[PDB]
Amino acid sequence: DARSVNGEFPRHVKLKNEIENLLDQVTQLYTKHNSNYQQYNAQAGRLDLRQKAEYLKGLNDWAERLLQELNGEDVKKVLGKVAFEKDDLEKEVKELKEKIDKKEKEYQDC
Amino acid sequence: RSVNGEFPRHVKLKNEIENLLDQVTQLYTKHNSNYQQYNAQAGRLDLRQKAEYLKGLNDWAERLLQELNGEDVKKVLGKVAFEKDDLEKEVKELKEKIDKKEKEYQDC
């Protein structure tokens, strides 16, 4: 057993371990989101309306943040910003190269 | 409206987490059955064909894994950050060239 197959068999095992680790992370997120609400219910009784909202909001905020970390949603928003600046800089570089070509024309004679 | 909308938000987050869990579970199942399929056909293939076959199965799984965990977006972010940095340095260099040209020919 444990052949190479041009490294593809060890790669199969590594991908299997990475998938299992993701499945474990998402399973614990799911389990904990559900138990968070059961815990809220248990402790909800002797909280006022405003404290109830602030408590359940805090639990929801913890789950949403962890989900966006696992699925890369957070990284996609940063990519959006950096891509917009990169696009503006590409247009600025084009404009400056055109300005340099015009300045060569401007001063061709002297 | 319903614990200030936090109860419906809990249910929404629950459905979004369950959808990710289902996607990762199907990816896991299919990666493992892909190998059982490979094992079944491995016998009748040469070394080159074995590598090409298992590589194709691995490529499928890795692409989907990197989609679900956002690794594909992180790699693209790395490249776009480096292109943005290169362009900022190119803007600076081009402005320097323009200022030098202007100074060179100020008497012209």
Residue numbers in the entry:
A (entry chain BBB): 4 to 113
B (entry chain CCC): 6 to 113
The authors write:
To gain insights into mechanism and biological role of streptococcal collagen binding, we characterised the interaction of M3 with the Collagen Ligand Collections (CLCs, triple-helical collagen peptide libraries formerly known as Toolkits), and determined crystal structures of the M3 N-terminal domain (M3-NTD), encompassing the HVR, alone and in complex with a CLC-derived collagen peptide.
M3-NTD includes the 110 N-terminal residues of mature M3 (residues 42-151 of the M3 protein precursor sequence). M3-NTD crystallized in several conditions with the best crystals diffracting X-rays to a resolution of 1.9 Å at the synchrotron radiation source. M3-NTD is a symmetrical homodimer, linked at the C-terminus by a disulfide bond ([Fig fig5]).
